[PDB]
Structure formats: C-alpha cells, structure tokens
Amino acid sequence: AFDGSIKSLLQGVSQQVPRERLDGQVSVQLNRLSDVVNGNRRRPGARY
Amino acid sequence: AFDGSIKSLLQGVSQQVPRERLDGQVSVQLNRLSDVVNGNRRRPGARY
Amino acid sequence: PFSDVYLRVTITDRQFALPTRLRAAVGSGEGLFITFADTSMGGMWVGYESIDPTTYVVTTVRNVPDGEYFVGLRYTSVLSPTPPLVRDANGIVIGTYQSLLVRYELTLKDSGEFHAIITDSSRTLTDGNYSSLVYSSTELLPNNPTDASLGRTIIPVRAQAQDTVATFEANADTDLCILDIEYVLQYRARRKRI
Amino acid sequence: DASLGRTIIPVRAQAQDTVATFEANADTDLCILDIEYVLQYRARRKRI
Amino acid sequence: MYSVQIAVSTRIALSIEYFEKDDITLYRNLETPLVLGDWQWDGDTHINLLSYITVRRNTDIDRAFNIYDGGAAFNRETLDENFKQMIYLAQEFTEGNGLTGLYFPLDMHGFQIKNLGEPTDPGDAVTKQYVDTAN
Amino acid sequence: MYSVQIAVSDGTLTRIALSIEYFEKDDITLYRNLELTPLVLGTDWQWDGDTHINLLTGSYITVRRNTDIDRAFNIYDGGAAFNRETLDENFKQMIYLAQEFTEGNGLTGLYFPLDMHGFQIKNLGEPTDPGDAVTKQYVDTANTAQNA
Amino acid sequence: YSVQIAVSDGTLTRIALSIEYFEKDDITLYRNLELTPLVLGTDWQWDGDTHINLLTGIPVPVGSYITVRRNTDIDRAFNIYDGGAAFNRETLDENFKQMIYLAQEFTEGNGLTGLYFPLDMHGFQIKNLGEPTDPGDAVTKQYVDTANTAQNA
C-alpha cells in the first residue's frame, strides 16, 4: 500500500472530469471560504 | 533521527499558517533589526 | 455566533419574547438557534422547549442564568473533495480502473463533531459522526467550549478510487477548518513501462 | 447504460500496419476517457 | 427513612427532601389521598391540617430532567441535577415506595411474614383467622 | 404499564402490536398463560417489523422487558471521541432499570422478614407444596369436609 | 453478585470472598437464621483483603451455614463537581458503577425492608413462608393440616 496528500484546497469549484482539473480545485463548496493564511473554514454569520 | 537548518531570518513577521509562509519569515519580532550583513541583532538605544 | 440575521436580547426567568423579524422564517421551517453572549461560556449552544402560538413567548432549557444572549438561524457548510489520482514521472494518468482507496486522513486546526457520508455507484459505504476531541484532552471541561486546538480523524472507504463521492457537513456552533488531507492507496503494477 | 466500465480488444499484429475504427449509431452515447495498450518490443543490443 | 415518614397523634414537620412541592402526598389510617385545600402548605417545611399520618414522595420517572442531545447546557449544574435525580430514584424504589404487585412467584427463603390483614375475598389468611376453629 | 404488556387471546390473536419501548430486541420474552418456561424464538414467535410479532403455534399472552444489569453500556475510554448520544444512552439505561423495578417486574426473593402494616394479599394462588401459604378458599372449604 | 452462602459439613473455619465491593465497611455476617449480625473483632477478622477468619465457635456444626451481605452508600453520589470534585473519566465511571451496584443489590432482594400497599399476586404462589410465632403472622401449610388432623378424634 502507498500513501499521499492532496496539494491544496484553494481553487474553488470545477466541473471538468477529474483527469483535467487543475491543482487545488474541488467538486462542491457551499457557505465556505477560500481564505488564504487561515485555510478553508466556514464563513461568519450575517448581522442585523 | 534527522537534522536540519532554518534557511534565514530576514523577512520579518507573518500571520499565515505555517504551511504557507515564505522562506525567512518569523512569527514575532520586537525591538530587533532585520539588518543584512550583520544579522538579526538588537536595535541601538535612543539618544536625548 | 454562527447564525444568520442575529439580534441581541435579554433572558429573565428562562423566558423572553421572540423578535418580530424572525417570526416569518421560523414559521416556514427555518431553525431557531440560541447562543451565549458573554462570560467564559460565550458562543455555546442552548436550546428551547416551546413557543406559545398566541404570544410568541419562548422557554429555554433548564439551568440557564439571567444575562445577555443572541438569537438567529442556522445554515450548512457542505464540502466535497475530489477523488485521488495516480500520476507517473511524465505526468500521465494511469490506473483509473485498477486502483482502490482505503482511507482518508484529516488534519483540523479547530473543530468539533461533524458528519461524513461516503457512497458508491450503487450503495452506501460509510456514515456517522466523527470528532477530533477525545476524553483525555484538557480542552474538554464543563463551562468551556468543546473545541480542540489540533487533532486528526480517520475514515475508511474500501472501494474503487474514482467511483466515490464524499461530503462533510456541519451546522452547529463549532467551526470546521481543514488544513490537510491524506489517503492510503492500493495500486500494484505487474509489468514494466515503456 | 453503465456509469463506468472497461473493454479489451485483441489485435496480435505489427503495430503500425493496422487500422482501427469504432462505430455507434444507436440511442446510447460513446464517451472515451482513456486508451491503453500492451506492446511487445525487445532490444538485443545497447544503444550509443 | 428517606422517602416516607410517619407521625402518630395539627402540625407536621417534614424531615425528607423533595424537588417540587407537587411530589408530596398524604394518607391517613391505612386508607385515597387527602385532597389539599384537608391540608395546605405553611412555609417550606411545615404542613397545616384543616391514628397516624403518612407522607410519601415520588419523583418524576418519565424522562431525565436534562437531555444533552436536545441542546441541554453543558455545565456542572446539569450533571449534578441528573446524578441527584438518579440517586433519588434509587432511594425511592429501594424502600418499595411504589410497589403494588408482582408477576413472578416469590420465595421467602424460610423467613416469615408479619403484620398481615384479615382476608375478605379468597386470598391469604392470618393465623388468628385459622386459630378461630372452636369446633 | 411501561415494561409489561398483556393481550387477551379470544379466538383471534395471531399477531400482537407492541406498545412498550425497549432498549434492544434481545430483551423481549413471552409466556403462554401461566407457564414458567418461556416460549422458544423461531418456533412459536418471530419478529416482523420491530413493532409486530407473528405467532406460529396458534388465554392471554404476556410480554416482558429486562434490560442488562451487568455493566454500564458505554465505557469512556481515553481515546474515544466525545459525543452526546454516548451520555444519553447511559442516562437512559438507569431510567429504564428504575421503571422496571418500580413495577415489581424483576424481583425474585427476600432474605429478611417481610413487614406489612395491615394490608392484604389478593391473588395468592393455590398451595401445592407443604411449605406454601394457604388461601381463604382452601381453609374454608376444608372445614366442610371435616364437618360431615 | 451481592450474597454468598457456605454450608458447613463440620469443618468450616475460613471463607474466601467471591464478591466485589467499594470499601470494607459494606460487608457483614449474619450466621444462618438470626436477626443480629456477628460482632466484628470478636466473632471474625479481616485477613488481608481476600479471606475472613472466624474466632468464636470456629468449627461450625453440621447443617449450619454462614452468609455474607453487601450494602453500598445510598445517601449521596461519591463525586460532586460543584463541590470541588475534578472532572475525569474515573469520576464518571465510578458514578455509574455506584448506580449499577444498587440495582444488583435490589434485584436479589437484599435491600427491600418494608411495604405500604396491598399486593396483587396474579395467581402466583409463595413457597418458603416459615412458621408462625405471633397472632399476626401468615399461617403456612403443614400447620393447618396438622391442627386439623390433630382433632379428628
């Protein structure tokens, strides 16, 4: 058995077949942030 | 066990997660100098 | 707090009046959410027991002291990675139909319990809650938030690599920050390449 | 229709003296993601 | 005693503890409980009446007071309250407060039963009833 | 009430609908009318839908619930992730046990003299063994025989 | 779980415990059919933590038996967090084990000591009723039969 690691998660959504997606693209994102420095975390709440 | 060395200390402070910081950046600096040629030493005193 | 269109309100004797701008949403399936607003326990979830249909008065769960609190609505934070790939020296892709995925490794900077679902072309494989906070961590105390400053989680898959879909949900007061992802891949070539 | 699968075809002939075609004129699609082959070549002297 | 107490001949001093004033009920002379407003509360530890008197305590059993799945607060007071309720339930059913029958035969291990009442319908008889043969 | 259910079998009972709540399906048992030997699963009754029981060899049927008493269900190991259901189940087990015991379902015997402050026993049953209690009927009807 | 009995053939002098407990204060001895426990320090001793040694009438006559009983604290929980108790895994495991023990003791009839409501036996029978000694006792069989047969003539 072998191991590995996904390069990054900072290129947002994509809809191409997995053979051609660039490095960092993901399949689904919703109510998240693509923030650098802090990572791929949740968005804050909306204030009234 | 293995060994290693930090590349340099001449890029000042940063606030990104360690995965993404560039080479040479540090976490905290105060009353220091980022001086080349002489290294990362303390600052001189203030004269009246 | 982790809620939408939230307002501040005072609670006395485990009762308060529902603000006007949330009556319409809660009446159409939206989920009411309450949180602490002050002191060390700030940000923690609290629940309710009933809502009077005529006066819109709300009664909270037992043992909540008088003070300031927030009130709002919930939302979800779905995410779904992309399946791994095998790539040789020159960058070509190989083994799309001859590889099997065994596991995921997740590193989290801060998080609580979340929900994970893994499914295949025709059946479900994995399901249930996961967390990175254990019973022997000093981070777990009463009257403190239930979050861990650093941890890891492991999830089994046991299926073909590319015929899979993975999702992670979280709709509670705790964050979900993903720093890195790792996997274990079982692939075995039986002839040289040229 | 099948969401994912594979097929194998034997040739057994000289590599470059061949012609291959794939036809389809029915209600089902035909999407080709990748193609692979098995080649039998054996050098008997070093190169230089 | 922890769940019940008995007074033998105006005022009754309660020594037991309770969660709410609704869990307390009264009975008189091995009787239907006395309807309050026959008795009424006078302070948090005295009962005013409007032979012997018995007091019984019965905490709620349908549900646990705090459910952490339904959003119950995660602090010390809820754990303490849950543990106290659990201990109170043991104090209650340990003394046979609510027992009213059995569905399985009972073995006394050779001991004896005392202070039994006379039968009216076919049941168990006391020694005195059998002693009164006098033929 | 909570842990015991009964069902009269007047010429028609072939299925029974459960009204009690149980921790797991393993805790259910059946007795036919008064026999002390429980019915055999797989030959006289079979589960249908987690809320219905099918009968295979057909008066009243009785249903019993008996939760485990050997251990607490969850043991909090030092490497187990924290959750709420793991506490809810433990707190539920104790309430189930208390409900079972308050109805007298699980009692089996005594090692002390039983005290009663003047109450009675109603459905004592007919003594067979020499070391048993005597009902009013047994003694009353015996006097007539020895009074011919 | 909570009760142990030993029947002596004429040489019983030592007993090996086969039941667990929280503290040594919970154990007591009652001989065979007496309503008074044996006095500690004059009738039996603690030997280590696994054996009990008799001191008075150590050779038990034939047919007599010794019984051991257990009773855990019921007044309060061992650990109260609001009273300064630390929060660990042990403080929860012990709290739950305390409640388990009280159920184990009750299911064997070692704890119940009274009744306040008439019972309905639903047709079941009592077996070992003992023998009457006072007018308020429940007369058992083989006592009515002897009395009735003793006056046939």
Author numbering:
A (entry chain A), B (entry chain B): 2 to 49
C (entry chain A): 583 to 776
D (entry chain F): 729 to 776
E (entry chain R): 1 to 9, 14 to 35, 37 to 42, 44 to 56, 65 to 149
F (entry chain L): 1 to 58, 65 to 154
G (entry chain X): 2 to 154
Task: Copy text from the publication.
Podophages that infect gram-negative bacteria, such as Pectobacterium pathogen ΦM1, encode tail assemblies too short to extend across the complex gram-negative cell wall. To overcome this, podophages encode a large protein complex (ejectosome) packaged inside the viral capsid and correspondingly ejected during infection to form a transient channel that spans the periplasmic space. Here, we report a near-complete atomic model of the bacteriophage ΦM1.
Using cryo-EM, we investigated the whole particle structure of bacteriophage ΦM1, identifying two decorations with relatively uncommon morphology, and a tail fiber/spike assembly with features similar to the recently published structure of Shigella phage HRP29 and phage T7. An adaptor assembly (gp52) interfaces with the portal and six tail fibers (trimeric gp47), each of which appears composed of long helical bundles much like phage T7, as well as adapts trimers of spike protein (gp39) which may be homologous to those in phage P22, another podophage, and 9NA, a siphovirus. Gp39 was poorly ordered in our reconstructions and was not modeled. However, AlphaFold2 multimer predicts a structure similar to phage HRP29 gp52. The short tail assembly has the closest similarity to bacteriophage HRP29 (16). The core consists of tetrameric and octameric ejection proteins which form a ∼1.5-MDa ejectosome that must transition through the ∼30 Å aperture created by the short tail nozzle assembly that acts as the conduit for the passage of DNA during infection.
